[PDB]
Amino acid sequence: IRQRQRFGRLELKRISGRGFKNDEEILIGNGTIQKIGIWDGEEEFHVRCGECRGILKKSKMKLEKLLINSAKKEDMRDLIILCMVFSQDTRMFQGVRGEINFLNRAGQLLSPMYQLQRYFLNRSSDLFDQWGYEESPKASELHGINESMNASDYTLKGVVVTKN
Ligand SMILES: Nc1nc2c(ncn2[C@@H]2O[C@H](COP(=O)(O)OP(=O)(O)O)[C@@H](O)[C@H]2O)c(=O)[nH]1
């Protein structure tokens, strides 16, 4: 619950909940099936990438909500991609269109989750293209954001941003 931890470029600190991890055979969007440890349970985290911070709520293979501050657009984009991956959202696994390696050249074992993080920080349009949008909030303290990190009347599903 109280410790700052890292998932690569993502920093997290648990707020609530508990996940339990089980290996599952996951179909990724390029057709491969890869065994991945999948977390089950409601969890909520403070999160950070750079100057952008947020609160992430996830359930099994689902980003439920991500509420972030306004920041440098590169950090907003990276926090959102990292939370989409850390969430293990079904849509994120479906977004792998291209080649992805789970062994290195010397045959050593690589972590699927970390390889997915590397994949999407390099290719985020694969994740955004099919993520989905929903109407932004109206008349509130929050606004919606599109995949270009601009305020918009429709927002990436589950994501909202605190008005300055
Ligand atoms: N949802 C959730 N993810 C976690 C937790 N602890 C570690 N992780 C993530 O779980 C994944 C673990 O991947 P990996 O290190 O490859 O370990 P493996 O599943 O044992 O092969 C990483 O994406 C970690 O950030 C947790 O308590 N909850």
Number of helices: 4
Q: Please, how many domains?
A: 1
The hetero compounds bound to this protein are: guanosine-5'-diphosphate
Tell me the overall shape. globular
Widest sheet: strand order? 1-2-5-6-7-12-9-10
Q: Radius of gyration over alpha carbons?
A: 16 Å
Helices and strands, in order, run as EEEEEEEHHHHEEEEE
Helical content (DSSP H or I, runs of 4+): 10-25%
Strand content range: 35-45%
Gap between N and C termini, in Å? 28 Å
Please provide the count of β strands.
12
Structural class based on helices, strands and sheet pairing: alpha+beta
Q: Summarize the main sheet.
A: 8 strands, mixed
What would you say this structure looks like, in words?
- The protein has 164 residues and is α+β, with helices and mostly antiparallel strands.
- The chain has one domain (1-164).
- Helix content is 23%, strand content 40%.
- It contains 4 helices and 12 strands, in the order βββββββααααβββββ.
- The chain has helices at 73-86, 90-94, 112-122, 125-131, and strands spanning 4-7, 10-17, 20-27, 33-40, 43-49, 52-59, 62-68, 133-135, 142-145, 151-152, 154-156, 159-162.
- It has an 8-stranded mixed beta sheet with strand order 1-2-5-6-7-12-9-10. Strands 3-4 form a two-stranded antiparallel ribbon.
- β1 and β2 (10-17) form a beta hairpin.
- The longest helix is centred in the middle third of the chain and has 14 residues, at 73-86.
- The radius of gyration is 16 Å and the shape is globular.
- Guanosine-5'-diphosphate binds at residues 7, 19, 37, 39, 43, 86, 111, 113.
